[PDB]
């Protein structure tokens, strides 16, 4: 009766465990207003305010968050909630409403459901990081 998915930015992992429930959204035991980078709350509120809470009617949504930084974790929770609702309606409800909510999310912003293609990369020898290198002198 349950779906188990995830969301992944740079280091932030957001584990989503959803099933038939009551509209319950716990993020390791706290709501979606109690995350201190709070302006980004609206980004954190984008799965609800775009789709309406009536579509989050009877679903238990557990969120357990690992790693990353705060902004990366917020986009991971946004990621995981959107993929969790879409995966729930695909596995347990039709293809049509899942496809419709996919088209609502992507045409708003693709980053809601797809991953980010880039990370803080490794280093090839010769500088501080990968791209910029050390500095020298003349004369």
């Amino acid at each position: 009766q349950s779906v188990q998915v995830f969301g992944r930015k740079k280091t932030a992992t957001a584990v989503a465990h959803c099933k038939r429930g009551n509209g319950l959204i716990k993020v390791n035991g706290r709501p979606l207003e109690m995350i201190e980078p709070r302006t980004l709350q609206y980004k954190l509120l984008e799965p609800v305010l775009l789709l309406g809470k009536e579509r989050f009617a009877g679903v238990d949504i557990r969120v357990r968050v690992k790693g990353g930084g705060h902004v990366a974790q917020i986009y991971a929770i946004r990621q995981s909630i959107s993929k969790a609702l879409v995966a729930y309606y695909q596995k347990y409800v039709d293809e049509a409403s899942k496809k419709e909510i996919k088209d609502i999310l992507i045409q708003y912003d693709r980053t809601l459901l797809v991953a980010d293609p880039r990370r803080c990369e490794s280093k090839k020898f010769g500088g501080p990081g990968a791209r910029a290198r050390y500095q020298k002198s003349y004369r």
Partner: peptide
């Protein structure tokens, strides 16, 4: 159930790290 969920999350994290 909670424990299971936690475990799953951990696993996911590990996978991500590996990737």
């Amino acid at each position: 159930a909670a424990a299971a969920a936690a475990a799953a999350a951990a696993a996911a994290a590990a996978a991500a790290a590996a990737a």
